[PDB]
Design a protein around this ligand. Structure first.
Ligand SMILES: Cc1cn([C@H]2C[C@H](OP(=O)(O)O)[C@@H](COP(=O)(O)O)O2)c(=O)[nH]c1=O
Ligand SMILES: [Ca+2]
Length: 129
């Protein structure tokens, strides 16, 4: 895989963000995770967590996997990096997302994220408390 530039347009929620990619506004859905909806328990915290990652970043990057790059809603499907830290993985590691939506062919970082989840669960963080 490889990283590509993007710039923040606006935070949305724990697992979606609006970025400018190749000069075009797009909504991105973070691969391999599920955050709670804003109206659900840990939703606000997940949204805040992701929001802070984007807004503090000097450099946002997107990384597509090997498969589908957009979903049926036209959302980009990527791993998102904030100053080199993967937001997807950070969310799971902190117990603010579950590993989810693991589809054949876009699953390059699956094991990395599962390892983070196992650690969040051990620590009983947030969703695992
Ligand atoms: C994360 C992800 C979601 N989706 C679709 C499946 C789900 O369809 P349904 O909307 O039919 O449930 C939806 C879940 O996203 P949200 O968790 O953002 O709602 O997005 C993909 O198709 N590919 C993916 O990689
Ligand atoms: Ca969600």
């Amino acid at each position: 895989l490889h990283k590509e530039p993007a710039t923040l347009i606006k935070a949305i929620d724990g697992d979606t963000v609006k970025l400018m990619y190749k000069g075009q506004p797009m909504t991105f859905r973070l691969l391999l995770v599920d955050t709670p909806e804003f109206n659900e328990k840990y939703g606000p915290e997940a949204s805040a967590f992701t929001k802070k990652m984007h807004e503090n970043a000097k450099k946002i990057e997107v990384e597509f996997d090997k498969g589908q790059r957009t979903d049926k809603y036209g959302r980009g499907l990527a791993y998102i990096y904030a100053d080199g830290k993967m937001e997807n993985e950070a969310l799971v590691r902190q117990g603010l997302a579950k590993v989810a939506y693991v589809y054949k062919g876009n699953n390059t970082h699956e094991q990395l994220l599962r390892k983070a989840e196992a650690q969040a669960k051990k620590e009983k963080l947030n969703i695992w408390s």
